[PDB]
Amino acid sequence: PPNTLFLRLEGALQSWGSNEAKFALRRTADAPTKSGVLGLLCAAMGIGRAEAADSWLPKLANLRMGVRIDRPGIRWWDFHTVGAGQRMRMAELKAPKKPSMVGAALAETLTPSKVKTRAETLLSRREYLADASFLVALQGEPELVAKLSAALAKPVWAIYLGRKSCPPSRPVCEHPPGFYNTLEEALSAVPLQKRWHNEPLPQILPCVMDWIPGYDGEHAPDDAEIHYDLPVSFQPPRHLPRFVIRRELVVGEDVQVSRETGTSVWRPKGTRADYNNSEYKKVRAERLVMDHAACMVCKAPATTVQHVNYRRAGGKEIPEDLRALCRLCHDACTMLEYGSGMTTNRIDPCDPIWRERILAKRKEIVEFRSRGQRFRKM
Template identity: 50%
Template sequence: MPRRPRNGRHRQGRDANRNRSRVMTGQLANTLFVRLEGPLQAWGDNSKFVVRRTMEAPTKSGVVGLICAALGLSRQEARAKLPELNGLAFGVRIDRPGSRLWDWHTVGAKVGNVTAAGKVKITQSTGEIETLVTRREYLADAAFLVALQGEPALIQDLAKALAAPRWPPYLGRKCCPPSAPLLAQPGPDETWHNPASMAGGLVEALGAVPWRPRLTEDFPSSDTISLPCLIQWQAPGATETAPSEAEVWYDVPICSDPPVHDPRLVLRTEVVVRVGKALQPPVPAPPRPRADYRDSQYKKQRQQRLEADHGLCVFCKMPANTVQHVTYRRAGGNEAPEDLCSLCRLCHDAVTMLEYGLNMGLDRINPEDPRWRDPILRHRKEILRTRSLETRRRWLQPEEVE
């Protein structure tokens, strides 16, 4: 029996579900968004030998290599896929530029350093080949949003691969794992505006994704923010010439083994985007620990501490009339003698002012620690000056008070 044809209402419902699924995946019809964020990143361009630098933003070869790893392609297998991936339009939005960090790296693969005469250097003490030391540059605490535009079928395949990569991805080097999912997706209550087609361009696509600060305290003063972008320039026609401000980046991969790259033209621009919700919700401060001063066990430990310190303040050696908690980890009657220290009232008030000003948690100030000597002395002087003024205000006329 032939199947009954679907009516228009069923077809409309099916199309609506398909469009809804596209919004839920976070990918526009022809655009793939990749979020690159991690403690360290390294995107080399023309680094050679023992000094390995990084570019200021992800390179196309680095992102293509990351996609090949997600697809599970070896270097030999990726060679056939490179022309298709190189045809994708490529743009980067710099959400957080990060800071540059240098580190050194030893290579112990029996390579060694070669002298001017062409001989391998030998360590005199061990007789072994001298270790090769290289310098590596990284981008610390950076975040980028990469937009790739191409055919919808290819974009969907790449989105599935990035959502469940076959091989572990890394941000330029194997020691740089990502700290967030690679596939950028909208939140439950977010909507990304689709630039509709490739005619919308990379700038419009990058402007469709809101910028999300890490913490609530990082919110800008306005609802929008301007972010720098690096956009791959593509000639609209055969006779078009590149703008004079275009930069040349040698990061289009042609072959992985040995590495061969072609140049591409990059334009710098800025895009104004909406500010979304913070990536990390505000963390409430832990409750300030309290001690049970009426507990009999605490009173016993307090007396033992005063006797152990011979009734003297551990800071100024004046007679002590109170004790201070060095840590509150066992507060509430379970204090150990080393959790307390004897202080006079003046030093106790100075230490308390410091602790409240620093919003300290369970572990507090140890007045016997030399690093706290100068701050405690400053607060002692401030307390003495304030109390002296208060006393003078009580007994002198207003015009006589400084």
């Protein structure tokens, strides 16, 4: 049975906040933090915000966290405005004299009219990461991983990517869970996917791993860091420092590169039906049989074929786009289409509105053409 699940994170923009934002300047981190994935998984299962602190957060906080960097983001900034044209809520309340009645006893006497409003404009700039990919591989109990995977198969609530406006563009439930001993082998097991054929590929793929305590004792290494993203409560938030190390993985020896597995550009269909293909000659012969080898305009025997429309070319040819006409009519309708730009639908000899033009063109052709130039091809 699998013991560790896999989550895939990708979007056009993402942000994962750090400890260095206690005001209107919101800065982001380089990688999705533990608290973000814990919150998303709580949303996917559908646990209440007041319930996460009661036997639900430490149960998953006992798991081991592992992140792999497929391609890192460009640090981007968006200017945000709050309360344009409106009046905001301010925090001051009048002093209630005696300090004995405070807190919840004071909140029972609160009224909607007791609050006061101020019209101003609150400006902020928020940082987002553009074009970033990550894999979250959480190692826990096989039953717990099964429950987590079943929950993320169909999330109860909607899910986002750190902020509510960052949408998923790849499935989070794309990777089936597996059984591996170490987080390194698990992060190396999930392959690396390409979008289109020619693009830069990172030769080194950084990974973020929790620092294993090893045996009893074993004080923290000098290259380990601290990170305040172990959530204990979510309303109001309570966060706890943790130990984080960094490892690297070179591509081409323990992670393979998958193929493109699709098409990027769209492009229009194929015009230019081939006139030497066997299906074309068979359909042309059958259409010459159907019309009894008579021209459609002037009723002289039929030698060539004109194409009414070019919806299908080469491989498929239903004999309803083809009509039988002779040489003069073919040349006349050919010269009627030199600068028309109608592409798909061509001239129909059955439709009477072209007949008077075609006959005048044929009169021109009989008036002007030199036979001896057509023969002796120079």
